[PDB]
């Protein structure tokens, strides 16, 4: 039968132009008063999935 | 059987649900009561096993109409 997408993965990764995946940074959900403005600022933009984790992400998202 | 003779209401099944959402099978029984119904046209009391809802139906439609339905249905009384 058709492979089933890991739905939670589809809610956290989007495929980019050259086949990589973008994701939102962790650590910007809650307790934030104690975190420096610089640290939170650098967590705001999306980042690319690293080479080690690309295999896991690709396995989870066959239909990306 | 626990069946309303007017409406046909019978036990149905469902679940108890706990706060933790544990489901356990259960039944819902009709609110049945054996009642003596005066039939003025027949000068007779007729006893029926009826739900409270069927009691209200008899109140709304008259005992003669309901007894006619029961006869048409084969339901003895």
């Amino acid at each position: 039968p058709k492979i089933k997408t890991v739905r939670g993965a589809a809610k956290r990764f989007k495929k980019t132009g050259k086949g990589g995946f973008k994701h939102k940074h962790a650590n910007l959900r809650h307790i934030l008063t104690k975190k420096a403005t610089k640290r939170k600022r650098h967590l705001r933009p999306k980042a690319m999935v690293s080479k080690g984790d690309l295999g896991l992400v690709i396995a989870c998202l066959p239909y990306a | 059987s626990r069946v309303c003779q007017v409406t046909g209401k019978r036990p149905v099944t469902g679940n108890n649900r706990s706060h933790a959402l544990n489901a356990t099978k259960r039944r819902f029984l009709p609110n049945l009561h054996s009642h003596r119904f005066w039939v003025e046209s027949e000068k007779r009391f007729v006893t029926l096993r009826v739900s409270a809802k069927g009691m209200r139906v008899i109140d709304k439609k008259g005992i003669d109409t309901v007894l006619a339905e029961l006869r048409a249905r084969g339901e003895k009384y």
């Binding site: - | 005066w38 003025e40 109140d59 008259g62």
Partner: protein, 41 residues
């Protein structure tokens, strides 16, 4: 329950009067005792 008295009933009223009684009063007394009839007409 709205009934039609077929006779004078104490606190209720007089023959012809159409009144509202508790369904139990009507079903188990007034009607079986010919003292009233349901208001259908």
């Amino acid at each position: 329950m709205q009934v039609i008295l077929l006779d004078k009933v104490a606190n209720l009223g007089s023959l012809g009067d159409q009144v509202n009684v508790k369904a139990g009063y009507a079903r188990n007394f007034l009607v079986p005792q010919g003292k009233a009839v349901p208001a259908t007409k």
